[PDB]
């Protein structure tokens, strides 16, 4: 109650000043739930789906890629994300194939930071399939 939820891509805007009681965000260092007066933090995101529960009967299943959640002192949040798409624009069939090919290059990485780049890529496709 008496909240404000803002959800904006760089090119488009989903929510402006319209809050619905509960926001689920995948944090880099875990996960959290927003329930009308959460103790404010400054967190950053991991690849994972955002399921905003509208009042409105049902929920809203978005899927962010990397953004920033700023819940602040007054009861108002500002969730800004870079690639915030829904579910139906994605195809599951291409997401299955992209996993094991990046696992195949993981053994074939000679350097230490180039292999660390491969570990970033397999994590994002892992949250891709399990969200589907």
């Amino acid at each position: 109650g008496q909240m404000s939820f803002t959800f904006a891509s760089p090119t488009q805007v989903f929510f402006n000043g319209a809050n619905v009681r509960q926001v689920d965000v995948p944090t880099q260092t875990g996960a959290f739930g927003i329930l009308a007066s959460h103790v404010p933090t400054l967190q950053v995101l991991r690849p994972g789906l955002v399921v905003v529960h509208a009042e409105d009967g049902t929920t809203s299943k978005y899927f962010v890629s990397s953004g920033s959640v700023t819940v602040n002192a007054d009861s108002s949040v500002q969730l800004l994300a870079e690639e915030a798409v829904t579910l139906d624009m994605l195809d599951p069939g291409v997401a299955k194939a992209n996993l094991e090919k990046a696992q195949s290059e993981l053994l074939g990485a000679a350097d230490e930071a180039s292999r660390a780049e491969i570990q970033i890529r397999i994590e994002a496709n892992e949250a891709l399939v399990k969200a589907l």
Binding site: P10, Q28, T29, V39, P40, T41, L42, Q43, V44, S68, A73, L80
Partner: protein, 54 residues
Amino acid sequence: FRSVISYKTEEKPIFSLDTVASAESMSIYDDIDADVLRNYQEYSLANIIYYSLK
């Protein structure tokens, strides 16, 4: 810019350093460490440039 006719050259600061962003107004805030604030303060540098570019 304000309108079609009149614009204005403006000024906005960038708190890029983590420790100047470590003051009295952040001790009220939650479990953010110097690694989380390192990742977050970088991302707001890319959001002030995209604001400036538009």
